[PDB]
Subunit: 150 residues, 12 copies
């Protein structure tokens, strides 16, 4: 693994994640609908911007971002599933949180890799993204009645 391969893997992950955010946005039901429906728009924008920043950082270090759905599905470690039967709001937020934790943990691996390779800019970028992910994990775990690392 080198930095280019890591960033491209995250281009794929973030495209799967933003589509998942839309799935949750569209299908959610329950008393917290109005608040969490809007919250998903905030996350969609934020992680869409993460995705563009990752892709353009990859461009700037001489790489070539994945840029088709086929490539995203071939490379993403984030999982997706069609919405077939009704899920509770908690179940949807557990799927969201689980994907946030996955991104956190993979970003930590990219932070270590970019440090080893001496790519200070990419390292810094990933740290800033992790800071936001860690905050989201605390808040969505709190919604679920749980501690952030529980």
């Amino acid at each position: 693994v080198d930095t280019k391969e890591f960033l491209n893997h995250q281009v794929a992950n973030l495209n799967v994640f933003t589509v998942k955010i839309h799935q949750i946005h569209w299908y959610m039901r329950g008393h917290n609908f109005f608040t969490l429906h809007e919250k998903m728009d905030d996350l969609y924008s934020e992680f869409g911007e993460q995705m563009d920043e990752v892709a353009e950082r990859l461009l700037a270090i001489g790489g070539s971002p994945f840029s088709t759905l086929k490539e995203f599905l071939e490379n993403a470690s984030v999982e997706e599933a069609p919405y077939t039967k009704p899920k509770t709001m908690d179940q949807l937020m557990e799927d969201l949180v689980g994907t946030l934790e996955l991104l956190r943990d993979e970003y930590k691996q990219g932070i270590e890799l970019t440090d080893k390779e001496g790519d200070d800019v990419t390292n810094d970028m990933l740290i800033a993204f992790k800071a936001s992910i860690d905050k989201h994990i605390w808040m969505f775990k709190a919604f679920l009645g749980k501690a952030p690392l529980e």
Copy 2:
């Protein structure tokens, strides 16, 4: 074909199209880079909003939008291809225009279908989207040195 099936087909198309817009945004080169790079961000936002409006109109008429990359690829008539060898700006804009024309022509079919079924709201929505697509076709054809229907 009924209105629900038509709208869901366009959810799939618009997700393939916005990813294609990003492909063009990222990989373009040439003297018009700064203008068209920004222009692609405008289109990305606009057609992303079309997509959300289509999906939520589908929800509001009792339908269930596709919400995974797998479903989008299974259903889209918009085509995608990985970016492997360098394309000129004109070639990228021809791919863009060709997809705009496809969406125009399929939206016209949805306009006829929703009129036949008496779904006035969906009909009106599609007409408004076609108005913007037709304007884009004129402008991007003009960039290419061509008439809008040439």
Copy 3:
């Protein structure tokens, strides 16, 4: 008059002036009396709806003026003509009961607007037709979202 048998764009629009005035007062009733854990979100949401349907009401009344009509403009007339129903708040209602009343009235307006859409189409009043379709688009979106709050599908 009954919208379902309604024959006349002017009559239909005036009926909706009455309806929308009853509806905005109902939105305030819900805004004021609601209790429960979703209070802060739904209290503000009712302010959004109050503004939106008040604007619908002004647009309907002024479209009626523009086609040569005379809008109802007193509480007496609104009560004499509205098919939207109201009731004084006497005993406690749960948030779900309040939202069910809201959704039921949205469905009534949706269905009456669809009657007006057909009527204006047949009479060739393209502007009024287009106006009502835009209003229905918003109502349909609200019905989906408030049904979702209630744990239900939009047309369930």
Copy 4:
């Protein structure tokens, strides 16, 4: 009459008044149409906000606001009449001014009542509303060519 009863009476009055403002807004004709049509929108907003503040102050002191057209008509002292025959702009503004004077004088009674009962917050709220009403009375009387209190 205690403070709760007084405030509820004004909830009723203000709902009759805002409908009257719309009657004037809709039916007015004459050379001052454009200015006064917009001015009525300003008043409609202002007295609608007074109405909500009165109702919510009533809630905060343990009361229950009237919340139906039926209740507003049964309790309002503000008068209304359907628009049957043409009225001049001056006649419409005379009706507006007459109602502003009614509200002014009733708010003065409410100011005295709340001072007697020790409800400092409600007292302060009513004084602020009267301040605006007094200003409107001066300006609309001036429009009519008259002194504010003549």
Copy 5:
């Protein structure tokens, strides 16, 4: 007639109309000067935007808009006359209203024409423009002390 010919006729009409609006803006006198002078600026912007939208819709369906004063005069049904003698504010507003009614009635013909030809986008555009014209006719007739269709 076909849709292209109709739209080009309105390009000509709207260019004559915006100049007429400026004529009224510049030469008006009377007590309502300040309000109506500014109101004509509002109309000038609005109908200038209608004109650009009509011309660019014409482009988008493969047409070629008139684009010279000579062509506008050769094709407009809206009439113009030099300001050679004093006119009252009522006379100027009667001229404005008459031209609004002419445009309303021609847009109605274009609405019927585009419906028959199946040009849903152009049909929708013309309806939106008629909606605004109908509102202006009510308001300016009210200024003149008249009912909208009087």
Copy 6:
């Protein structure tokens, strides 16, 4: 010490500087530790309250300066003088429990502000009297809304 025995306006205002500093820290405690389905709404709502009561505190302190007083300005002084109580967050609290603590403190401030309104009216300090009434107006509105969240009437 006790606001019910406040000798004068200066002492009363300084007591509220102390109270409001304890209260804004309690608002942060609730903001940070809350959990439950209403988290996103109430977490933001606590930021609104923190700003508002922080501004009340600065206004009280600067009014005290303007009448020749000297505001408390250390944590030690705030703790020596506040009647608002605080406790470290040890065992978990439900969202409703946190909101009950918030409402209880709002009621305490309401009732002490009422004492200060009566005191300043007696002393003829019209400006301070008016300031306290405006603050009470907001507190009364908050009590209604947070009681509604809890499913209760405002004075229940």
Copy 7:
């Protein structure tokens, strides 16, 4: 440079009398055009108050000392004022406003010639800009009165 200084100071005095007159009209006007003209006077009050500050601060920048008391304004202004004793019609109030605008126009024209003769390009340019606005106001308020700008 004393002639330019004296001219600018005379206009500090004029503009302070004028803004008070604008308030007089703003406060006492009655009639059907009240709402439009009441607000219009607020626009004029702001604009001519800003002219006044610009004039005074230009005077400072060329080494002068602006009049800065009501007593001095009255001792020096050529703009006239009168207490409001009996009601005036809206047209009468607008005629007074227009007359004062014409007075300022004509005195500024004198100041434009004076500053050109003295070679004070900055002050000359400032006065031309003010006259441009005054000329526009004269056209618009004359039109309100049913009149041509210079008739």
Copy 8:
């Protein structure tokens, strides 16, 4: 109601003298605190000009007739003015400003008692709000001078 009317009109006169004094300070000040206090005077000019318009329009709304000429302001104001003849230090200018703020504070206190006695709740409330701001300014400008607010 004539006592409330007379009080408000007296304050129309005072505030017109005061805003001109604020301009005097704004224009003539010199010293190291120039940039901050020059801008601060613009804030005060706007605020007390708005108080003046609010006072005059409240007077109109209770049936009164505001003074509306420099002559009337001078005949009635208790705020004093003096031509700027010899340079003053920045501290001296701020002492004059503070003294005038204290004058307005104390007269408003009288007006607050008067309107309470006459039962004019609206005017009473307006004056209290103005006094609140004046009291804050007195604290801040006294602090600038190194002094306590009431010392």
Copy 9:
């Protein structure tokens, strides 16, 4: 007729009312018919110019009113008096050709405004003189920038 023979300021300004109305229509012609790789930038740029020269036109007309004149106010009058030329769009023009036509018209207006500056200076109309200088300043900047687009020096 010819600005080089303009008898007075009123006649000159009215000639420019005519010129600017022909010019804004030409700007729209270019805006609508342009094709080529610089389309998106120059299509928007023509909207900027249309607004700016439309404002110049209104300023010229209202200055003419303020000095006792009577602006041309019909297409017929504009065509009878303009020295700016127009032609229908028939055969295709390149973007560079359209920009050459634009620059040529800017140069015409520059040179006529210079005549009006000299005329108003002679007549002592300081306000109109100043207005025309400000307009020339913008035209000179546009000539530099559009000549640069064409690969040329401003006065080449």
Copy 10:
């Protein structure tokens, strides 16, 4: 020490510091009053935001922030004292600068600590806060006529 303990210590410090900022804001006198009174409002907001960011970072790593005045006093190394006698503006600013230097030096220790523990996000947060403190130290030292590290 570990990262959680360090961050909680700074929650305590920052709550003592914001109260000290208010002390200076309220009691300052002298010719620089207007500028420095407003400047303390800027600092109050900034360090209040640092405090919330520190507390919420602590939450996001599984910690529990101090949340009472009692705990803040038990744990802060920033010192406070009642305002009992007149201080010059220089004295107040010397107290401010001394506390900024204390915070700078403790943040340096936390930067080293979080680096050693591998908490990249917390490390990055503390560096950004130190950057602002270092700038303030230069500017307030300049106010006092001193070099930044004098």
Copy 11:
């Protein structure tokens, strides 16, 4: 000296002046630090804009602006010196005022020159700049306790 040579001389002057403004911005100390540090940013922006407008006016009259530090130093009459020993705030403001006076007096020569040559646009531009310089001279002299021209 013709207009082109004069304008180019001021391009050089203004580049030396903006660097001097930064020197003062960076090195100033004393009780007026916060106010004057920000004031220097205002001046830096203003005279940078003057410089660009001068250069672009020179372009529009067929000239070629100096565009290197070497050229600016060879042509500027504004003087510069490295900051070697401490200067008081008053000394720094005296240097600023002295340079403003230099620019004022040179712009006056340029105003005379452009009037002689008939360059009305350049003449007008220089007068506007002098207007601002004259205002700054009054205000900074006032800061120093002096009359504007003494």
Copy 12:
């Protein structure tokens, strides 16, 4: 001094103060003299870069102040110390040549900032290190975009 052998954070930062002043003047050179069909877009783009790198320059100088240094503050010193090169504009340059000069200078700054990033890391100046990384991130993005304009890959 030579950044590549640079030993001292203060020396490195001051060297970049000099560089950034030469660079912003070069950006103006390009802004003023450019010609060609991309004029309107790249003329504005140079304004963006001028503001951005001027802000970098102020941030570098003030970081140097904050660590006890003394920024160069005269054109003489900037020329004595900059490694960024400048040349008078004498003969015409194509837009591509101007953009090649821009890109070459961006690459020089990138590579010198990387030297400063390593130096500040070794010295333990975390704040200066973080500042330089943020600046490099922007420079790297510009290099990609301007190379794309030139038809080249970012590191080609």
